[PDB]
Design a protein around this ligand. Structure first.
Ligand SMILES: COc1cc2ncnc(Nc3ccc(Oc4ccccc4)cc3C)c2cc1OC
Ligand SMILES: COc1cc2ncnc(Nc3ccc(Oc4ccccc4)cc3C)c2cc1OC
Lengths: 309, 272, 272, 309
């Protein structure tokens, strides 16, 4: 798996990555902010390169940070055309900071909120990006994503589709005490039950996402009989949401609108039984993927026609 | 009128109060007044003039609450924007940090005794009619070993709730199934007396298993499993009879099935 | 073993205690520890190693006794020969000195309210199971007016008994007929719960009549008259109904005929 | 009522009474002690006269002592052959002191305890001394004794029989808080009941005393049937004692032993009804008094034959 032009863009990152020996807290002159849940679009002064710095409050002792940043260097070999190339990691006052490759288009959760609903033709290109992203991580690093969200898929104006923020540093995860839950969950039914999860658990999260990307609304619970009729064109508790994922039928794509290839694709992912659920190999040779693999879509053209630049 | 309380309203003579170094959400200061005393500084939420009965009646009711297993609530005063809780300093470490500090004995006798100290303190609160709500292992101090209980009853101002809604780690598994079913916009939750006896149950699990359940599972996993009443194992060796049976009582899906602290005390005194 | 208690055994932080001027049988000192605090110095009787249960169990039980109508018992420590009782300083004067200090209002409302404060404090002692025994008007302080009760439960070490046998003035008429029949060699007297409700009765007389009964009669006269249940008059003007009727209840010859403090509270709340 | 030799001994006291202008606390060099319930046989240095100083602890404010010693000067006109002539009164540190005429024989309570039982012939002379003592106090000063005890009748080796310690300063009495009761009471039944008492109340105390002086034992309760049989020759509560004085028959002198005159005398005094009880006038003309008035007894001779000197 290698592309001619993509081999250029990757090694063009390896050059500007050696421009920085060590990261300083004052080298990053604050410019703007992406979001919170807290990322910054700072500007490195020695290298002269704008990147995405991410930091969140953490009260830890020096004995912990020595093993946090230790397991945080694994991301170096995880450079991929479908994975955001990170730079480094350090410590600042009372919060750990991580700078990654800047994506001037933002995450898909922001794009979905702007464009309303994303066309099927585009979702096909994004679908392939996720598959190779998980395969490259599991085969060459023995690491899964553990958390796939529309806000975890970064997209730039260069046409690249990469992943970000995945479980790799298990030491850092324990430090993140009192974390937010959310009104919208992408958890797989087997993880909610406490059972062991494979890389196919991220497939559920991928499928559940794609449905939301297509209709412009979180799939659970399924729309009414009048809501879906006025959505075509161009107040629950948390436990009730999670329980609906387990004991109630999976979400489904609207008929007629989307092609049968795309309808079947998300249905193979949203199987409540992980055993009969499709894997990274089966998805790679699916009718929807093989058709969308040969598609020709101006991904950067449609993107900049919605968010600008 | 009584939207603000003073230190002179308390039965303990206060002529001067000084503040030492910082040792603490709430900022805990190492204060002093002729005896080492802990001081918490929390800025209350703006407005809410309806917090008369929520403070002039609530935190003021901590007067006439004296016990050997409960921290000596010195008192508190609040300006309309600010608030300072004064309490006796615990001359030791927290039960949280000692149950994970390898290696402590905590055999059959010790563990049973420590559990008997908690239920005694909670029993006095059971009589005074005050719910601890946030009963964690981080709210218990050990030294002599002398077991005391702090951060009790005072919700809203304390954690650990806050459009995603943030939930703590330990407190999530300290909740009873009737309370582990929250939405995003909420206190004012079904907190009962059986809510506290559940929290003790996971602490009783924390004593023997050296920590609280659901050690690796993510937040959403805890909410559903504990929500459907999927109580964690206990035969992880070595417990057996006598022990672990009380766990089933304190973790009963129906709150009415859980014993009261006064009733619970008899179950602990029975030895293995 | 536990024949001596320390200040560290109390729940209140004690790092330093200083003593001021003398303001007090027992020597009462105007001590201080970051707040004005009264200190009593009494040398206990020699020997009596059986005073384990009489102090290690008695005065130590004053821990976990917190109330707004009862003085804040700071604590106490005792060397085998010496003893020092620490308590919160009352920021005012005694009810004794104010009921005779002309001229105080103490109308129908005031007198009833002050009496309601005493019974509330005695009511908390009624629940904890502790007899005041020596309940005088000299053991009540007034300022705000905030009514508090001191010198409670601690007999033997305190007065007022001692081959003629010495008896105080006020305490002689504070006793119930079952107790006003003592010999010369005696505590260990029939002190009951109705003993305390009698003492309040003469205080309730002291409030309206501005002093305690048997104002001029000699000691032997009090012993026989009160012994035969010759309760003093009350229609000395102006009382009438409602009032003075409660006097008959609190001064009943049979102790069982006297109401409990909890029962008594309803008789006071009924207004005139 | 005046005696030739007694007129000498009285005016001999008026001379040495003017020797002292004011009493000083250091003028009285401590020598010995009489008793407690606290009297001293001190020695005045300026006047050079030994007298009986009496002091007892009293915590009072200066505003009280100004009216205590004020009413304590009434004793000056109360000079009588049957009343101990006092000197003065002052204040010392925290106790009021009173110096009276020294009686080198002591009170009768001490004499009774030494001699065992006092002869009838002697009690006759003492009986007259009490009558005139109460009459002189009530007629010329309008003051009664209010408390007659065997320990309140002083006797010297000069043959004089005088009284001491009687109610006169009503301001001082209130200061004497927490006073002792006693296992032996001389209270009259009417005072125990709270009723008003006259000078005839002291008569009861006189009669009740005389019985004790005669048998060498406190009359209440009356002796057994074997105790009195082994007393001829040469565990109760306080309330039960007082109640026996009220609702039970009065004490009585043993028959045969004492003359009928003396038996009738104490019986006229120990009448539980003050109305029918004899008064100071009736006692003065009683058969026992008129007979004992003409008696010739070596009072000082029998006294010094028991206590010495
Ligand atoms: C020595 O380490 C500590 C001893 C403490 N002792 C007593 N209260 C504390 N903190 C505390 C805990 C709770 C609190 O607020 C209360 C709420 C309700 C009842 C009592 C206290 C106020 C304070 C000051 C303490 C904190 C300490 O370090 C974290
Ligand atoms: C300002 O005047 C006083 C304030 C007092 N406040 C509080 N206790 C006192 N005295 C007192 C009264 C009783 C006492 O012994 C106790 C026995 C049992 C329970 C509480 C105290 C110890 C002391 C120190 C006080 C005395 C005072 O002057 C006489």
């Amino acid at each position: 798996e290698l592309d001619e032009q993509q081999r250029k863009r990757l090694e063009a990152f390896l050059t500007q990555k050696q421009k920085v020996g060590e990261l300083k807290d004052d080298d990053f002159e604050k410019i703007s902010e992406l979001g919170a849940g807290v990322v910054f679009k700072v500007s490195h002064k020695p290298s002269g390169l704008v990147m995405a710095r991410k930091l969140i409050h953490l009260e830890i002792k020096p004995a912990i940070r020595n093993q946090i940043i230790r397991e945080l260097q694994v991301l170096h070999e995880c450079n991929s055309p479908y994975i955001v190339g990170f730079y480094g990691a350090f410590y600042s006052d009372g919060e750990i900071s991580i700078c990654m490759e800047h994506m001037d288009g933002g995450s898909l959760d922001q794009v979905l909120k702007k464009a309303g609903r994303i066309p099927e033709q585009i979702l096909g290109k994004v679908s392939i990006a996720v598959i190779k992203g998980l395969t490259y991580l599991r085969e060459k690093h023995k690491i899964m994503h553990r958390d796939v969200k529309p806000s975890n898929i970064l997209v730039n104006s260069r046409g690249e589709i990469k992943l970000c923020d995945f479980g790799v540093s298990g030491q850092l995860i324990d430090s993140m005490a009192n974390s937010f839950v959310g009104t919208r969950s992408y958890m797989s039914p087997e993880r909610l039950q406490g059972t062991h999860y494979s890389v196919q658990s991220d497939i559920w999260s991928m499928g559940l996402s794609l449905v939301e990307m297509a209709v412009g609304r979180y799939p659970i619970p399924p729309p009414d009989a009048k809501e879906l009729e006025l959505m075509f064109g161009c107040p629950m508790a948390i436990f009730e949401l999670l329980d609906y994922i387990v004991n109630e039928p999976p979400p489904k794509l609207p008929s007629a609108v989307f092609s049968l290839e795309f309808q079947d694709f998300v249905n193979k992912c949203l199987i409540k039984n992980p055993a009969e659920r499709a894997d990274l190999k089966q998805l790679m040779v699916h009718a929807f993927i093989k058709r969308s693999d040969a598609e020709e879509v101006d991904f950067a053209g449609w993107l900049c026609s919605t968010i600008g630049l | 009128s009584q939207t603000s309380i003073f230190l002179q309203e308390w039965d303990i003579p206060f002529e001067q109060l000084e503040i030492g170094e910082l040792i603490g959400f709430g900022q805990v200061y190492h204060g002093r007044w002729h005896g080492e005393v802990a001081i918490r500084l929390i800025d209350i939420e703006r407005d809410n003039e309806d917090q008369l009965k929520a403070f002039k009646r609530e935190v003021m009711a901590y007067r006439q609450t004296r016990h050997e297993n409960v921290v000596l609530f010195m008192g508190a005063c609040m300006s309309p924007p600010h608030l300072a809780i004064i309490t006796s300093l615990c001359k030791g470490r927290t039960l949280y940090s000692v149950v994970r500090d390898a290696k402590i004995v905590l055999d059959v006798n010790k563990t049973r005794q420590i559990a008997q100290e908690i239920v005694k303190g909670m029993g006095y609160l059971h009589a005074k009619g005050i719910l601890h709500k946030d009963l964690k292992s981080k709210n218990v101090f050990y030294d002599n070993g002398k077991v005391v209980i702090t951060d009790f009853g005072l919700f809203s101002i304390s954690g650990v709730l806050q459009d995603k809604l943030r939930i703590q780690n330990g407190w999530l598994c300290h909740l009873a199934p009737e309370i582990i079913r929250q939405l995003s916009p909420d206190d004012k939750l079904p907190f009962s007396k059986h809510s506290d006896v559940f929290a003790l149950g996971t602490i009783w699990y924390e004593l023997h298993a050296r920590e609280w359940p659901f050690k690796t599972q993510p937040a959403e996993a805890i909410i559903w499993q504990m929500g459907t009443g999927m109580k964690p194992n206990l035969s992880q060796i070595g417990m057996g009879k006598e022990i672990s049976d009380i766990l089933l009582f304190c973790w009963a899906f129906e709150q009415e099935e859980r014993p009261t602290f006064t009733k619970l005390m008899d179950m602990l005194e029975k030895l293995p």
